Design a protein around this ligand. Structure first.
Ligand code: A1BQ8
Ligand code: ZN
Length: 140
């Protein structure tokens, strides 16, 4: 589990979104595994605006933050899980790292701020949903 709290937005994995998220919906994209909902309180996270390929992510199944190198956001064939059939997931970045389903939502961050959230993995591979192209997270 986990979210990004930026401005009056809450950024979650679409497959973990609650009823309250869907009732306060701003934007959702199944192909990216992303959903954004509105919040009453302002959040403290800042979004990175960059092409970093190094950063640190939170792994809940180890209670540890790991430094990683990660690929640029891409269209990547992701094998079927409990939440999605085998499909191309878009805006996905891959790194070598431990992940399990409940790690979803862990933040990846670089020197500039938040880069994305854990979305998928297995076999020592972790995939992150990028948010750095979502420039509207920084306004209104
Ligand atoms: C963060 C994270 C998210 C998901 C959904 C998984 N499990 C998945 C993904 C693809 N598979 C196929 C079915 O057996 C291989 N299982 C994992 C391990 C980590
Ligand atoms: Zn950066």
């Amino acid at each position: 589990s986990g979210a990004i709290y930026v401005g009056n937005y809450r950024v979650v994995n679409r497959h973990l979104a609650t009823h309250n998220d869907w009732a306060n919906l701003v934007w959702e994209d199944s192909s990216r595994d992303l959903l954004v909902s509105s919040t009453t309180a302002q959040g403290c996270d800042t979004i990175a605006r960059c092409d970093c390929q190094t950063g640190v992510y939170y792994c809940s199944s180890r209670r540890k933050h790991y430094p990683v190198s990660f690929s640029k956001p891409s269209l990547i064939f992701v094998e079927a899980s409990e939440y999605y059939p085998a499909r191309y997931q878009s805006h996905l970045m891959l790194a070598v790292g431990h992940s399990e389903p409940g790690d979803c939502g862990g933040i990846l961050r670089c020197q500039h701020g938040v880069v994305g959230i854990v979305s998928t993995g297995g076999n020592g591979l972790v995939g992150f949903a990028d948010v750095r192209d979502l420039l509207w997270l920084d306004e209104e």
